[PDB]
Amino acid sequence: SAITKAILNADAEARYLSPGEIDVVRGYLASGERRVRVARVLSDNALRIVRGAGDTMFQKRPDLVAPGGNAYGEVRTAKCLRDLDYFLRLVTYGVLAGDTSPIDEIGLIGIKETYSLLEVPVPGVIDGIKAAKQQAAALLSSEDAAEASFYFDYVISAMS
Amino acid sequence: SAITKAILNADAEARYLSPGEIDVVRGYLASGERRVRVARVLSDNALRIVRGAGDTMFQKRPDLVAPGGNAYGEVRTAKCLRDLDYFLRLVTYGVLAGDTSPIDEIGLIGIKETYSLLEVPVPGVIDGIKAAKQQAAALLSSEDAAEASFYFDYVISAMS
Amino acid sequence: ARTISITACVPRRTKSVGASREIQNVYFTKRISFDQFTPEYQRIHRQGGTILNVQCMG
Amino acid sequence: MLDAVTKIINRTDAEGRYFASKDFDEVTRFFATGEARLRAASTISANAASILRESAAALFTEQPDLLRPGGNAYTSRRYAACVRDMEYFLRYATYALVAGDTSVIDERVLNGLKETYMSLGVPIPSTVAGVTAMKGVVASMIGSEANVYFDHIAKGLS
Amino acid sequence: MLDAVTKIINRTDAEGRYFASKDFDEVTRFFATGEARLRAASTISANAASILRESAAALFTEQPDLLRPGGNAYTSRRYAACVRDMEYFLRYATYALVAGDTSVIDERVLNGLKETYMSLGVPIPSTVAGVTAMKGVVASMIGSEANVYFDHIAKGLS
Amino acid sequence: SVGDLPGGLWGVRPGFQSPPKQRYRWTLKQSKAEKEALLEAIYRQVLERVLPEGSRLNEEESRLNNGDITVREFVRRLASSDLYVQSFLVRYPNTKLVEKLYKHLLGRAPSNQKEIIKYHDLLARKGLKAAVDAMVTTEEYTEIFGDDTVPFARYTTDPAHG
Amino acid sequence: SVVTKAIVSADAEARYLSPGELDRIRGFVSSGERRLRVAQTLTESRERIIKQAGDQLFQKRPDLVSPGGNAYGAERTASCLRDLDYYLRLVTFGIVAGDVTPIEEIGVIGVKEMYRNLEVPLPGMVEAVKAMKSVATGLLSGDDSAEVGYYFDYLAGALA
Amino acid sequence: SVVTKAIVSADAEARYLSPGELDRIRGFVSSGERRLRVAQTLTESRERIIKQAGDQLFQKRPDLVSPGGNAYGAERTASCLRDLDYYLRLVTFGIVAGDVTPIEEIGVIGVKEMYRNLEVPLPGMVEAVKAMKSVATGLLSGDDSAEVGYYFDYLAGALA
Amino acid sequence: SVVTKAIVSADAEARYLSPGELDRIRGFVSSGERRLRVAQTLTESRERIIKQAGDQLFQKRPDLVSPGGNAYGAERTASCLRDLDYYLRLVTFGIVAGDVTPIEEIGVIGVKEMYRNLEVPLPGMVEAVKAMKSVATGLLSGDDSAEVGYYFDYLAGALA
Amino acid sequence: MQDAITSVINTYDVQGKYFDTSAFDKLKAYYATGELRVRAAGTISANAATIIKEASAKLFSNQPDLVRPGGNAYTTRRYAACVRDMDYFLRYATYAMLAGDTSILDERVLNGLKETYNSLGVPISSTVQGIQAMKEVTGSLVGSGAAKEMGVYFDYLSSGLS
Amino acid sequence: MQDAITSVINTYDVQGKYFDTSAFDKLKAYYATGELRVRAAGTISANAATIIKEASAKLFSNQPDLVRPGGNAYTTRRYAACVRDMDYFLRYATYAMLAGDTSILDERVLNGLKETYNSLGVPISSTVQGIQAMKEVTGSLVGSGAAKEMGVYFDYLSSGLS
Ligand SMILES: CCC1=C(C)/C(=C/C2=NC(=C\c3[nH]c(/C=C4\NC(=O)[C@H](C)[C@H]4CC)c(C)c3CCC(=O)O)/C(CCC(=O)O)=C2C)NC1=O
Ligand SMILES: CCC1=C(C)/C(=C/C2=NC(=C\c3[nH]c(/C=C4\NC(=O)[C@H](C)[C@H]4CC)c(C)c3CCC(=O)O)/C(CCC(=O)O)=C2C)NC1=O
Ligand SMILES: CCC1=C(C)/C(=C/C2=NC(=C\c3[nH]c(/C=C4\NC(=O)[C@H](C)[C@H]4CC)c(C)c3CCC(=O)O)/C(CCC(=O)O)=C2C)NC1=O
Ligand SMILES: CCC1=C(C)/C(=C/C2=NC(=C\c3[nH]c(/C=C4\NC(=O)[C@H](C)[C@H]4CC)c(C)c3CCC(=O)O)/C(CCC(=O)O)=C2C)NC1=O
Ligand SMILES: CCC1=C(C)/C(=C/C2=NC(=C\c3[nH]c(/C=C4\NC(=O)[C@H](C)[C@H]4CC)c(C)c3CCC(=O)O)/C(CCC(=O)O)=C2C)NC1=O
Ligand SMILES: CCC1=C(C)/C(=C/C2=NC(=C\c3[nH]c(/C=C4\NC(=O)[C@H](C)[C@H]4CC)c(C)c3CCC(=O)O)/C(CCC(=O)O)=C2C)NC1=O
Ligand SMILES: CCC1=C(C)/C(=C/C2=NC(=C\c3[nH]c(/C=C4\NC(=O)[C@H](C)[C@H]4CC)c(C)c3CCC(=O)O)/C(CCC(=O)O)=C2C)NC1=O
Ligand SMILES: CCC1=C(C)/C(=C/C2=NC(=C\c3[nH]c(/C=C4\NC(=O)[C@H](C)[C@H]4CC)c(C)c3CCC(=O)O)/C(CCC(=O)O)=C2C)NC1=O
Ligand SMILES: CCC1=C(C)/C(=C/C2=NC(=C\c3[nH]c(/C=C4\NC(=O)[C@H](C)[C@H]4CC)c(C)c3CCC(=O)O)/C(CCC(=O)O)=C2C)NC1=O
């Protein structure tokens, strides 16, 4: 989390937390209620967010589910929607942690090699995540949507 | 020791002792009698050297033993005089070995941060060590005093 | 993150003998971070070495 | 390293589930104790040299033999290393206090420390006594907020 | 590594006492024997190549099966390594003879050597026999001055 | 004929750095003064001079003294440490960082455009740490400096090794 | 400063600033007004902070201005107060920067060698800085007092 | 040189010369007259030493100056005696320098490659150096003979 | 090429070429006329190869030239066929060189970054290379088709 | 590098002065724009690859000879190097905009850049054209104030190159 | 580097000659001065910190603007760099006095130092004045003959930087 990153910077220099790192930890603890609120909203509506995101993605990119497409068939399309749900859960982890470290540690490190071996079109994943970002921003206030959009955009940029 | 330094230099190059290194070892083995004499004189007179050096140090810097001084009280004055005795023993070791390796290994490496964390005034220690040098020179001949003063001055310069 | 203890013997069978000490470079144990574990593994193998033991402290 | 939030995240991720109300409850409790834990850590940091000096004084007064010739704390170098290790313990206990988790202590301090101390000849109960004295001083200055982390260090050494 | 003077200094320092009469006696006895040990070490250095040559000849006359195909000393490179190890033992025995103390042998030669030979497959008893033959050649050339250090190497391997 | 530094007209070496022919090797059982001198040489060679006191690494030095890590690992960590960043990275472009890393980690200069391209690409895409990791895991480093010697400026032609 | 530290950390990793670093900068620029008011407040309380800190130091360390002390005389006491003067200006710089980078770069790196070369006792540094802490934080409200105390504690820890 | 090796050892550790290195330099300079008389003695009898050593070498190794030998012919024998003279001069240099550094930098580094390119047998060089050693130590007293013999012994070991 | 690899391998070991390296070069130079005739055959049939390979590619991946595809439009289809022609010329270069080094240096290093910047799907590149390989090998004899298929398989593996 | 705040700090430290009304006003000016700069940096970071795709497409459409055989960007490697350099220019412009200072463009980018490009033969006018196209693409994302701000650092780079 | 002995050896070796009477005279001269040089070197090493303290005090008293804001020695870092430079000057002058030869000052100190000082903005005349201050203090501590010996190497450094 943000606390972990501040502690790591303090450890690398063999010193206690600095005034800047203390401001960081304090401002993270002050964001606790807002981050928890956004995380509850994204977690409780996860199923419908994924449903809408998958619908939008498959509309934009029919060849994904078209015969010969990567997501053709029930199992492969379900696997796709499982991946979208994974990325949404990682986005909630990032919202609570206050950094992108859990998102990297669980899903982003090695995702490009994975998707290249499986011939998963990364731009289509980017459309799916963009759709999920829009669905979630619908269910959040402007500040809350901005808070979640940071991690959605981080996932998108790490893909592309 | 001098032999240790010659051998470490020869071993660093994976070769045998060179004529210069053999000459260094021979010079040390020749100076051994004078070295043992100086070390014996300093060893039998340790009590008076440390007592006189402590007296003149505490006279030069009475605030050290004054209330709020780093050596105030019986225990702290005892530890101060024990440190002076330690440094005299290290000077005898250096006189015997022919280098400062015993002095560095036993007493000097780490003394600066030790006295820093203890807030021991290094100038007070140097006053005591110079005082011990004059006490020793009083008991030694001119050449013996010079030989001892080499290692005394090494200790002072490592402190400073 | 995590650190791995490697114990290995890397011989010198491909090069001329020398009068310097190399017993350290030959048989060793070291702590390396996980990200360096694959490079260390492959370089031990490429030099004809044998990985005697692998440990993960914890 | 892990803080409390990352530990909860790893629990949920191993289960594969989104955060539930229970997990959100532990997260809110951590956020609630955060400001007081920050104040305690800042207090420790402001007095680190004093705490270290007092705890070294206590350890060596209680075990004077360590400083005598032939003791493991006898030389300027070995004494400096002893107080250096005490500083390690204090700083990593403060990290663990801020993070709300002992993981930093395990990975950065305790991992292989017993083996290192036996190889060096450092006496384990003497070091544990030093950690206990440090715990007492820190408790006197900030209360009982950090003594779990000192207890963790003492158990890991033991 | 230590020499005799440094060994005595460490012994006195572990007790935190100044040099007394007996310590000055070991020190003066070390100084008295210094020139003979230097002459022996110079003699060994001047004749190192020959000493090594008939030491290898003695070893491989006693144990020709080391040089036969499938033996540990069978290849140009492995024979090179054998003679290189014997040169190690000779040089470090000379260092120990000049220092008068066998520590340099312990840290520089014997530390990890037995495990390294077992990993390499180098036969310990044959290496001990080579050290013994080298000891015989050196003793024939200079006398018994360097016997103790070769015996130390043999015990370390054995 | 006697006592000339390598380099001819350029046989000079700034006194802040080590003498050009000195070699600093880690052994497992060596004196504490030898250990401190080795650490000082590592700083002098990676960072080109001794830092003001208070700037040296704490935990890494303890690991190196104990033998938990090696000289190569210490050099790797220093060359990517905040000291190296504040000393060289913040004041130079990455092209200059390529020659700095060659001088510090390999004791020489890049000889051709491919040698520059490799570490410049690493710096451009992955940063200083990746470039340092790549440079100290080269076989050239492993064969010249090994695992326990401080890197040094190399002055004898050795075409097989760069 | 905060922004520079973020940019340098991102630069050395060849990346754009992550959401966490942008959060750090956002919180920093949101607090610029109160930081700047605090720095102003410390700037008007210039003569009083320096004068009272000097008085407290000289009372708790009378040896410094006694004969033979480092701060003995009018000129040496003026140089003494001028150093406290420097350090208060650095503390204001660090407050506006949001980090202790100005303090570290202008008055901490090399400070040990400077004061060793000048024979100025470091525990006198520490006590004068703690006196400045008490006087300065006596002039601010709750949160600002703690915020400025952190800078003073960094500086007093660095001088130790 | 002794002085140069002491200075370079001090420079490698960025320190002033220790008491041991200064003692080494004192020992070297105190012997300057003796080694300088030895250099003069070897220099004055160079014709005698070269002629006797060549005679001893050619009696001990007749194959060198018989047909098919490297020194066969008067011109090649003169070249042989000429670089015997080279090594005698290098020995005198090393004697005044107190170390084999001049010998190593003028006549040892790269000597094996030179004598392979010239087809000079290295065992013949070793025998020639031993003949020069015997002749040159014959002209000196025992104590001087030993110290010169060390230089010749280093030379013979370097050629082998 | 083959000669370049042999020389580079010998130079990395700082030696002359061994008998095996010269054997590689002799084998390469003996087969020169066969490689040259294969390359002439492929260069004569440039446009017909590219036309048929493009036809099979767009037949098996119609989504590329379908609306929304990367190659939709006459300009983008022409760019696609142009890239196929580039890689065909590279394959002829590699065939005469006896190794894939020209292919690697001109059209493989940085290819993935290039096509990611161009939104070009890598599996489509792989399918295009397979189609071009089919067309090119169908024009060759049984023996020649094997080695040219090896170059096409290297190219397809590199684009994958 | 220097940001705006450390620029003011350095000016007043060199004068040996506390902050006065002018210094506090400069700092207020920087803090006021900080939210805009952070928003622009986040927007740019979110769209960086898109910006580079569009800017490189425009530059290679306006100068097709760069990517055809004989051009400086004709190979996959030199194309990759070219869009990598565009990534430099974008990322360092974003750093400088977020700092409010052109210093990092001086230490990290411009120093030695003309020499590097002239030695390689990289056409400097074409690189400036690519920088201009990148400026236009970025302005068409970040918004009027942030576009006007990013433009300052893009023109700083262009002037430094030309 | 060279000492007086190595200088003589170099002359006679490049000329190809054995030592003559004049060479033996030069070598006798160096041996005769050796005791004085060793004594002076020990005195300097015993007193190096005090010499630096007195010399920097005199330099910063004569030129008080160096260590005030705007001066090149105003910050703890730049003051530390200053006194460290003076310490290295003292140590290398002591080396060159032992060697009886100024070659080590050419190999380890002077070459490129004027350029570095100009590039960093270090005042060179002030540095020469500091070297002169060290000269005065050292001459006070070593005595008349050793002072005349050390003055040669101090003036060599001064003229090299001037
Ligand atoms: C929580 C951390 C985590 C992540 C992120 C993750 C991604 C992931 N997705 C996979 C498969 C897959 N992923 C997808 C999704 C794709 N389908 C369409 O093309 C879309 C463009 C796109 C998603 C929007 C599909 C279809 C597969 C099956 C591929 C196959 O059958 O070969 C696989 C291979 C293992 C498997 O068979 O499931 C991984 C590792 N796995 C993880 O454990
Ligand atoms: C054999 C190598 C060795 C040395 C050199 C050494 C020095 C040393 N002195 C110490 C304490 C001390 N040292 C002193 C000496 C100071 N008193 C005055 O101020 C003087 C300026 C100065 C002496 C001239 C004093 C007063 C203490 C007690 C300080 C305290 O406990 O707070 C300590 C801390 C541990 C202890 O209390 O014993 C060490 C390590 N210890 C060693 O094992
Ligand atoms: C100075 C301290 C030191 C020692 C002692 C030392 C021993 C040593 N000997 C080695 C090889 C060897 N050593 C031997 C020794 C011989 N085997 C024959 O049977 C004989 C019985 C025997 C000697 C009398 C052989 C044959 C090898 C080659 C092993 C192989 O690679 O197959 C190696 C492996 C590295 C290399 O080949 O260079 C070491 C480390 N290394 C050191 O740094
Ligand atoms: C933050 C991670 C970390 C830890 C925990 C750590 C502990 C540590 N302590 C060490 C030495 C030491 N540690 C001690 C401390 C003991 N002596 C006893 O008297 C005391 C009771 C006790 C301390 C309370 C001593 C004396 C040494 C020196 C041992 C020697 O020189 O032989 C060493 C060996 C390397 C060195 O000399 O610096 C390590 C690795 N190092 C690390 O990098
Ligand atoms: C100052 C350091 C130095 C040395 C030592 C040196 C030796 C040297 N000896 C040479 C020739 C020679 N040197 C010898 C000597 C050999 N003949 C017998 O075999 C003996 C075993 C042995 C001498 C004891 C002979 C016979 C030649 C002539 C062979 C030829 O012309 O190739 C040459 C070739 C050029 C010339 O004749 O001047 C050199 C360079 N050169 C140097 O710059
Ligand atoms: C000799 C090394 C080399 C290569 C290979 C190379 C390729 C290359 N392909 C490009 C565009 C393109 N490349 C393709 C080809 C792909 N699209 C389809 O999906 C197919 C699967 C596939 C071809 C088989 C297409 C369609 C474009 C146009 C993309 C666009 O601009 O929107 C461009 C941009 C400039 C232009 O369009 O003229 C280059 C430079 N350049 C080089 O210097
Ligand atoms: C942040 C500061 C910085 C910059 C900018 C920088 C640029 C830089 N670009 C390089 C190569 C290159 N750069 C380019 C880019 C050009 N191609 C032209 O067509 C375009 C007009 C133009 C880009 C828009 C190209 C093609 C090369 C390859 C040159 C070659 O291999 O000959 C190189 C040589 C090493 C390598 O190939 O990776 C450097 C150092 N380095 C730095 O440290
Ligand atoms: C911004 C970084 C910086 C600092 C801090 C700094 C301090 C500094 N203090 C100095 C003297 C001094 N500094 C002090 C202060 C000490 N005396 C007492 O012991 C107190 C404990 C303590 C003050 C609280 C004194 C008394 C002097 C006069 C010493 C003399 O006369 O030589 C000097 C020598 C030249 C001068 O007078 O200016 C410097 C450079 N310079 C810098 O560039
Ligand atoms: C052993 C041979 C040797 C020398 C001498 C040497 C000098 C040297 N001095 C430097 C900086 C410096 N040197 C000085 C000293 C000057 N400023 C004051 O005004 C004085 C008048 C004057 C000294 C009396 C200062 C202040 C700096 C810091 C410059 C800066 O940080 O910008 C630097 C730049 C790197 C660094 O800061 O560590 C070098 C290389 N390097 C060498 O290898």
- Whether H123 has its CB under 8 Å from any CB of chain E: the answer is no
| CA–CA dist B7, B4 (Å, integer) | 5
Residue (of J38, A145, J44) closest to G28 by Cα position: J38
What is the per-residue DSSP string for F91-141?
Answer: GS-HHHHHHHHIIIIISS---SHHHHHHHHHHHHHH-HHHHHHHHHTSHHH
Contact G54, J42 (CB under 8 A): no
Cα of I80 from ligand 6 centre, angstroms:
6
In the sheet that C27-33 helps form, which strands lie side by side, from edge to edge? Answer: C27-33, C3-9, C50-56
| Total residues belonging to chain E | 158
Coil, strand or helix at F76: helix
Residue (of D15, C12, F33) closest to B101 by Cα position: F33
| CA–CA dist H110, A66 (Å, integer) | 75
Residue G31 CB burial class (10 angstroms; 0-12, 13-18, ≥19)? middle
D87 backbone dihedrals φ, ψ, rounded to 5°: -65, -40
D131 backbone dihedrals φ, ψ, rounded to 5°: -65, -40
What is the per-residue DSSP string for E19-64?
Answer: --HHHHHHHHHHHHTHHHHHHHHHHHHHTHHHHHHHHHHHHHHH-G
Contact G104, G5 (CB under 8 A): no
Helix (H) or strand (E) holding C52: strand C50-56
Neighbours of E77 (CB within 10 A): 14
| CA–CA dist F48, F51 (Å, integer) | 9
* Nearest residue in G to K48, CA atom: G117
CA triple D6-D7-D13, angle to 5 deg: 85
Cβ of F70 within 8 Å of Cβ of C39? The answer is no
Contact G27, J119 (CB under 8 A): no
Rg over alpha carbons for chain G, rounded to the nearest Å, is 18
Residue (of E57, E105, E102, E101) closest to E83 by Cα position: E57
- Whether C52 has its CB under 8 Å from any CB of chain E: the answer is yes
The three state secondary structure string of chain G is CHHHHHHHHHHHCCCCCCHHHHHHHHHHHHCHHHHHHHHHHHHHCHHHHHHHHHHHHHHHCHHHCCCCCCCCCHHHHHHHHHHHHHHHHHHHHHHHHCCCHHHHHHHHCCHHHHHHHHCCCHHHHHHHHHHHHHHHHCCCCHHHHHHHHHHHHHHHHHCC
Residue I85 CB burial class (10 angstroms; 0-12, 13-18, ≥19)? middle
Give per-residue burial for G126-149: e unless 16+ CB within 10 Å, then b: bbbbbbbbebbbebbeeebbbbbb
C-alpha D47: how far from its chain's center? 15
Please identify, by atom number, the ligand 5 atom nearest to the C-alpha of residue H54.
24
| CA–CA dist C5, F128 (Å, integer) | 26
Residue with tokens 């007093």: G156
Residue (of I36, I144, I50, I139) closest to I92 by Cα position: I36
Residue F135's alpha-carbon distances to E148, F105, F110, in angstroms, are: 47, 7, 12
Structure tokens at A105: 């540690």
Contact A35, A144 (CB under 8 A): no
- Whether C36 has its CB under 8 Å from any CB of chain D: the answer is no
Q: Do E and A count as touching (3 or more CB pairs closer than 8 A)? A: no
Residue with tokens 């003497």: D126
| CA–CA dist I118, I114 (Å, integer) | 6
CB G84 near ligand 8, within 6 Å: yes
Rg over alpha carbons for chain A, rounded to the nearest Å, is 18
- Whether J112 has its CB under 8 Å from any CB of chain F: the answer is yes
Contact H52, H133 (CB under 8 A): no
Give per-residue burial for J108-140: e unless 16+ CB within 10 Å, then b: bbbbebeebbeeeebbeebbbbbbbbbbebbbe
Cβ of F81 within 8 Å of Cβ of A12? The answer is yes
C51 backbone dihedrals φ, ψ, rounded to 5°: -85, 110
Beta-carbon contacts below 8 Å between E and H: 12
| CA–CA dist H84, H51 (Å, integer) | 10
Please identify, by atom number, the ligand 2 atom nearest to the C-alpha of residue B84.
24
| CA–CA dist H48, H43 (Å, integer) | 10
Contact B95, B151 (CB under 8 A): yes
The three state secondary structure string of K54-119 is HHHHHHHHHCHHHCCCCCCCCCHHHHHHHHHHHHHHHHHHHHHHHHCCCHHHHHHHHCCHHHHHHH
Q: CB under 8 Å to J121, separation ≥6 — which residues?
A: J72
Contact C12, C19 (CB under 8 A): no
Q: CB under 8 Å to K104, separation ≥6 — which residues?
A: H7, K1, K92, K95, K96
Cβ of D80 within 8 Å of Cβ of B114? The answer is yes
Residue K155 CB burial class (10 angstroms; 0-12, 13-18, ≥19)? middle
How near does any CA of chain D get to the CA of C29, in Å? Answer: 14
Residue C51 CB burial class (10 angstroms; 0-12, 13-18, ≥19)? middle
Structure tokens at E58: 């003695």
Residue with tokens 């890049």: F110
* Nearest residue in E to C17, CA atom: E81
As a whole number of angstroms, the longest Cα–Cα distance in chain F is 48
Q: CB under 8 Å to H158, separation ≥6 — which residues?
A: H103, H104, H108, H111
- Whether H20 has its CB under 8 Å from any CB of chain F: the answer is no
C7 backbone dihedrals φ, ψ, rounded to 5°: -125, 120
Neighbours of H19 (CB within 10 A): 22
What is the per-residue DSSP string for I19-42?
Answer: HHHHHHHHHHHHTHHHHHHHHHHH
CB D88 near ligand 4, within 6 Å: yes
Q: Do I and H count as touching (3 or more CB pairs closer than 8 A)? A: no
Contact F33, B97 (CB under 8 A): no
Solving technique for this entry? cryo-EM
Contact J142, J43 (CB under 8 A): yes
Measured distance between the N- and C-terminal CA atoms of chain J, rounded to whole angstroms: 23
| CA–CA dist F88, F123 (Å, integer) | 13
Q: CB under 8 Å to H71, separation ≥6 — which residues?
A: H58, H64, H65, H77, H79, H80, H124
Residue with tokens 């070796």: K13
CA triple A35-G13-A25, angle to 5 deg: 30
| CA–CA dist A136, A131 (Å, integer) | 9
- Whether G15 has its CB under 8 Å from any CB of chain F: the answer is yes
Q: Do F and A count as touching (3 or more CB pairs closer than 8 A)? A: yes
Residue K23 corresponds to which amino acid?
A
Helix (H) or strand (E) holding I66: none
How near does any CA of chain F get to the CA of B105, in Å? Answer: 7
Measured distance between the N- and C-terminal CA atoms of chain I, rounded to whole angstroms: 23
Residue A33's alpha-carbon distances to A29, A30, A37, G42, in angstroms, are: 8, 7, 6, 34
Contact G20, A2 (CB under 8 A): yes
Residue with tokens 């075409």: F159
For ligand 3, which residues put their CB under 6 angstroms from it?
A: C 11-13, 17, 21-23, 26; E 59, 66, 72-73, 78, 81-82, 85-86, 88, 108-109, 113, 116, 120, 122-123, 126-127, 130
Residue (of G77, G93, G67) closest to G128 by Cα position: G77
Contact J71, J79 (CB under 8 A): no
- Looking at all shown ligands, the one closest to residue E127's CA atom is 3
| CA–CA dist J77, D142 (Å, integer) | 60
Residue C16's alpha-carbon distances to C43, E84, E146, in angstroms, are: 19, 11, 30
Coil, strand or helix at J63: coil
- D16 torsion bin: left (phi>0), alpha (psi -120 to 50), beta (else): left
Neighbours of J26 (CB within 10 A): 16
Q: CB under 8 Å to I59, separation ≥6 — which residues?
A: none
Residue D121 CB burial class (10 angstroms; 0-12, 13-18, ≥19)? exposed
- Whether J13 has its CB under 8 Å from any CB of chain K: the answer is yes
Residue H160 corresponds to which amino acid?
A
Residue nearest to atom 10 of ligand 8 (CA): G79
Structure tokens at J115: 């020499």
Residue nearest to atom 14 of ligand 6 (CA): I80
Cα of B82 from ligand 2 centre, angstroms:
8
Structure tokens at F11: 């046989």
Cβ of F59 within 8 Å of Cβ of A14? The answer is yes
Question: F103 forms bridges with which residues in the sheet?
Answer: none
Structure tokens at K130: 């500091």
Structure tokens at H75: 């011109």
DSSP state of J10: H
Question: C29 forms bridges with which residues in the sheet?
Answer: C7
CA triple G4-G9-G12, angle to 5 deg: 120
Coil, strand or helix at J123: coil
Structure tokens at G90: 């650095």
Residue with tokens 């090494």: B154
- F54 torsion bin: left (phi>0), alpha (psi -120 to 50), beta (else): left
Question: C54 forms bridges with which residues in the sheet?
Answer: C6
Structure tokens at J95: 């750093």
Residues of H with CB below 8 A from B28's CB? 23
Residue B52 CB burial class (10 angstroms; 0-12, 13-18, ≥19)? middle
What is the per-residue DSSP string for B43-73?
Answer: HHTHHHHHHHHHHHHHHH-GGGTSTT-TT-S
Residue H95's alpha-carbon distances to G43, H41, H107, H148, I70, in angstroms, are: 72, 11, 15, 7, 83
| CA–CA dist F82, J111 (Å, integer) | 22
- Looking at all shown ligands, the one closest to residue G111's CA atom is 8
| Total residues belonging to chain H | 160
Residue K159 CB burial class (10 angstroms; 0-12, 13-18, ≥19)? exposed
